[PDB]
Amino acid sequence: TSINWPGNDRLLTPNMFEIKRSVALDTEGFTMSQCDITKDWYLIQMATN
Amino acid sequence: DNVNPFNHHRNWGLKYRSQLLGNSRYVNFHIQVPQKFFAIKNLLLLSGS
Amino acid sequence: DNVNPFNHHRNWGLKYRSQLLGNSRYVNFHIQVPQKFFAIKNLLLLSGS
Amino acid sequence: QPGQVLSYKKFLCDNYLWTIPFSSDFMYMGELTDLGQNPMYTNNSHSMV
Amino acid sequence: NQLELMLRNATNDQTFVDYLGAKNALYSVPAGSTALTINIPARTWEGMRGWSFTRIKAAETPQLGAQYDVNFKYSGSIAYSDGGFYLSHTFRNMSILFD
Amino acid sequence: NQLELMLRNATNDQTFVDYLGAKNALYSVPAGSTALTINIPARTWEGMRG
Amino acid sequence: LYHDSGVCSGTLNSERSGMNVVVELPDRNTELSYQYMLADMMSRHHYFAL
Amino acid sequence: LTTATPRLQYFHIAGPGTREYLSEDLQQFISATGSYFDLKNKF
Amino acid sequence: RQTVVAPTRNVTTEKAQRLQIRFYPIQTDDTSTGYRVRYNINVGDGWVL
Amino acid sequence: YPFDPSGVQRVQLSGG
Amino acid sequence: INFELDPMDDPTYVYMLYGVFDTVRVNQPERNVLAMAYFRTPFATGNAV
């Protein structure tokens, strides 16, 4: 109930796997490859595949 | 023969590049531009500031 | 009995907190916010950068 | 007018089945993953959510 | 320098505890519902101090771990962030079953 | 016959794995709901791939 | 200040090793913790404007 | 690996206590400079 | 069947380290014909970029 | 730095 | 943990707080070497590598 698996401040959103964000409400960035997919999720997918 | 064939509406590459921004002339783009200088495009920086 | 009692104009703390900024909605506020994270709230840092 | 337009960044990814590898660095270093043989999970019961 | 060399020593280094000393979990209770069950999986409960609980309105609590809560359309007193608790009542009973 | 004798030996016998290598669980989500929680109990995760 | 929010957390570390030492968890309440610390440390009717 | 601590004395959750894990010179320094520069809340 | 096995040690930090770091400019100096940006890539000990 | 060979309930080790 | 409540007129959270020793000790062996190890005795958030 308390152990996030990355759990080492790995991702830019360390507590969850943010697959996508709303670009209109996006402010800090964290959207990758000219769409609403995030930097963290894109990194995860590219590293996996 | 002397006319640039890449300045054509059937330039599928440019067509894809333009349709990634939207269908309007008013684009709030978010793009990621790679480093291309050969000395630093693949350089592996070690510890330091 | 289930209504938030602190959302009241007789909230003396909130009354004083709003009166510390001024009587207008246009405030050039100047404040000093303390650090509250427990690990660094009272941490006595030694020499270093 | 430019103030009367919006943006709808979006992606479609069919036939993919998003993958999150159980690896420390999220890369593939073997089918038996980096954390698939760590004796925190293998030897001890954990209840993931 | 004496204090520095005496604080860099391993056996005497600074230790801090968060004063609340609580893991904060919010369990949603819909409007008309009058009962709630908190299911916790197996754990080793090593050194548990006890339980503490109230109920807080959903509209009055920001979503935890949020850079920006878009549903948070309330600016009164967040009883989660401060101690402004006012719903300690409306608690009929409670049961704890370690297994 | 030589193949049969060298294949009936215990140390060299066919080993097969399902290629997908996945335990498949379908967690229902109603029409309008935008959230889902997956509470799986304590397990030994002894070799989970991801 | 952004407390207990991992997505937008703070950062303290040395410069020699840029390894952040402040880890913030969504399930801790830094601000209510300071509320309780201050309330136990002194009576709350005191108005300290700083 | 040179310490072998029971992981609760490390965090002073069930430790021996401040009076017997700080250095004697550290305790003397805290006692001497205790009227103007407190250090008890850090251990 | 044979399986390749991950190195399971001496390959990933157990310490809380960021997977992906964004750097925002120290200096901007926006001009008419260009948009300069100046960063400070801080690579501490134990990191390779 | 602490070494925590516990299969359950390990420390965080923010470190640096 | 089984709760029975007075039925209110709006969705409410139940702010459950456990009793945890969310401690940390600071290790500062040399100059500009800052390292802290956290621990939370019932609900420790640390994970393997």
Q: Return the residue of E nearest to K26 by Cα.
A: E14
Min distance E84 CA to chain D CA atoms (Å): 31
Distance CA G31, CA G41 (A): 15
Min distance H22 CA to chain K CA atoms (Å): 13
Contact residues, chain D, for J6 at CB < 8 Å: 40
- Helix then strand then coil, in percent of chain H rounded to 5, is 35, 0, 65
DSSP letters spanning chain E: -HHHHHHSSTTS--EEE-SS---EEEEEE-SS--EEE--------TT---EEEEEEESTTSPPTT-S--SS----S--TTTSS----SSSEEEEE----
Pairing of strands E24-29, E15-17: unpaired
* Method underlying the structure: cryo-EM
Structural tokens at position E68 = 């920006």
Buried b or exposed e, range K36-45, using 16+ CB within 10 angstroms: bbbbbbbbbb
Using alpha carbons, list the distances in angstroms from residue G21 to D1, G48, I10: 49, 31, 21
Distance CA A5, CA A11 (A): 11
Q: What HEC string does chain B produce?
A: CCCCCCCCCCCHHHHHHHHCCCCCCCCCCCCCCCCCCHHHHCCCCCCEC
The chains in contact with chain K, meaning 3 or more Cβ pairs closer than 8 Å, are A, C, D, E, G, H, I, J
Whether chains K and F touch (3+ CB pairs under 8 A) is answered by no
| Count of residues in chain C | 49
- With beta carbons less than 8 A apart as the criterion, state whether G42 and G34 touch: no
What is the end-to-end Cα distance of chain I in Å, rounded? 37
Whether chains I and E touch (3+ CB pairs under 8 A) is answered by no
Give the count of beta carbons closer than 10 Å to the beta carbon of residue C40.
Answer: 18
DSSP letters spanning C1-49: --S-TTSSTT-HHHHHHHHTT-SSS-------PPP--HHHHS----S--
Contact with chain D for residue A46, Cβ under 8 A: no
Reference A3, options E41, H16, I20, I3; nearest CA is: E41
Query: Does K26 contact C43 at a Cβ distance shorter than 8 Å?
Result: yes
Rounded to 5 degrees, what are φ and ψ at K23? Answer: -90, 170
What is the end-to-end Cα distance of chain D in Å, rounded? 48
Reference J2, options H11, E63, A4, E88; nearest CA is: H11
Structural tokens at position I20 = 């992906």
Structural tokens at position C20 = 């510390």
The chains in contact with chain H, meaning 3 or more Cβ pairs closer than 8 Å, are C, E, J, K
Find the Cα–Cα–Cα–Cα dihedral K2, K6, K7, K11, rounded to 10°: -70
Contact residues, chain I, for K29 at CB < 8 Å: none
Residue G22, exposed/middle/buried by CB under 10 A (0-12, 13-18, 19+)? Answer: middle
Contact residues, chain G, for K43 at CB < 8 Å: 27
Task: Give the distance, in angstroms, between the CA of residue E66 and the centroid of all CA atoms in the same chain.
Answer: 16
DSSP one-letter code for F43: B
- With beta carbons less than 8 A apart as the criterion, state whether E14 and H42 touch: yes
Reference K19, options E19, E99, E64; nearest CA is: E19
- Tokens 């507590």 correspond to A15
Kindly tell me the sign of the dihedral angle through the C-alpha atoms of C2, G30, E74, E65: negative
E89: amino acid identity, one letter:
H
Element (H, E) at G28: none
Structural tokens at position E16 = 């801090």
Q: Could you tell me which residues are beta bridge partners of residue K23?
A: E17, K39
Contact residues, chain E, for G28 at CB < 8 Å: 18, 20, 22-24
Whether chains B and D touch (3+ CB pairs under 8 A) is answered by yes
Using alpha carbons, list the distances in angstroms from residue E41 to E97, F10, F31, F45, G28: 12, 42, 28, 15, 20
Using alpha carbons, list the distances in angstroms from residue B3 to B8, B17, G18: 10, 22, 55
Contact residues, chain F, for E42 at CB < 8 Å: 41-42
Residues 10-29 of D with CB under 8 A from E: none
- Tokens 């043989």 correspond to D37
Distance CA I13, CA A10 (A): 11
E24: amino acid identity, one letter:
N
Task: Give the distance, in angstroms, between the CA of residue H26 and the centroid of all CA atoms in the same chain.
Answer: 8
User: Which are the contacts of I16, defined by CB distance < 8 A and separation ≥ 6?
Assistant: A8, A9, G19, G20, G23, J12, J13, J14, J15
Q: What HEC string does chain I produce?
A: CCCCECCCCCCCCCCCCCCCCCCCCCECCECCCCECCECCCCECCCCCC
Contact with chain H for residue J4, Cβ under 8 A: yes
Contact with chain D for residue K46, Cβ under 8 A: no
Contact with chain J for residue G17, Cβ under 8 A: yes
Reference F48, options I45, D40, E73; nearest CA is: D40
Residues 60-79 of E with CB under 8 A from C: 60, 76-77, 79
D36: amino acid identity, one letter:
G
Across chain G, the runs of DSSP E, i.e. the strands, are none
K47: amino acid identity, one letter:
N
User: Which are the contacts of C25, defined by CB distance < 8 A and separation ≥ 6?
Assistant: none
- With beta carbons less than 8 A apart as the criterion, state whether H28 and E2 touch: no
Across K2-46, the runs of DSSP E, i.e. the strands, are 2-5, 12-18, 23-27, 35-39
For chain J, how big is the Rg over CA atoms in Å?
A: 8
Q: How many H helices and E strands in chain D?
A: 0, 0
Rounded to 5 degrees, what are φ and ψ at K25? Answer: -125, 145
D2: amino acid identity, one letter:
P
Contact with chain D for residue A34, Cβ under 8 A: yes
Distance CA D21, CA D30 (A): 11
Contact with chain H for residue E3, Cβ under 8 A: yes
Distance CA J11, CA K27 (A): 14
B interface toward D at CB cutoff 8 Å? 22, 24, 26-28, 30
Residues 1-49 of D with CB under 8 A from J: 39-40, 43-46
User: Which are the contacts of F21, defined by CB distance < 8 A and separation ≥ 6?
Assistant: D31, F49
Distance CA E33, CA K7 (A): 6
Distance CA B20, CA B18 (A): 5
Give the count of beta carbons closer than 10 Å to the beta carbon of residue D24.
Answer: 24
Using alpha carbons, list the distances in angstroms from residue F45 to A16, D32, F40, I12: 20, 12, 11, 20
- With beta carbons less than 8 A apart as the criterion, state whether C4 and E86 touch: yes
What is the end-to-end Cα distance of chain C in Å, rounded? 53
Contact with chain J for residue E44, Cβ under 8 A: yes
Distance CA B14, CA A41 (A): 28
Across chain F, the runs of DSSP E, i.e. the strands, are none
CA angle F44, J4, E47 (to 5 degrees): 80
Buried b or exposed e, range D2-18, using 16+ CB within 10 angstroms: eeeeeeebeeeeeeeee
Q: Return the residue of D nearest to I4 by Cα.
A: D30
- With beta carbons less than 8 A apart as the criterion, state whether B30 and A31 touch: yes
Q: Could you tell me which residues are beta bridge partners of residue E17?
A: K23
Distance CA G35, CA G50 (A): 15
DSSP three-state, residue K27: strand
User: Which are the contacts of C32, defined by CB distance < 8 A and separation ≥ 6?
Assistant: G50
User: Which are the contacts of G35, defined by CB distance < 8 A and separation ≥ 6?
Assistant: E81, E82, E83
Residue K9, exposed/middle/buried by CB under 10 A (0-12, 13-18, 19+)? Answer: exposed
Alpha helices in K1-49 (DSSP H): none
A45: amino acid identity, one letter:
Q
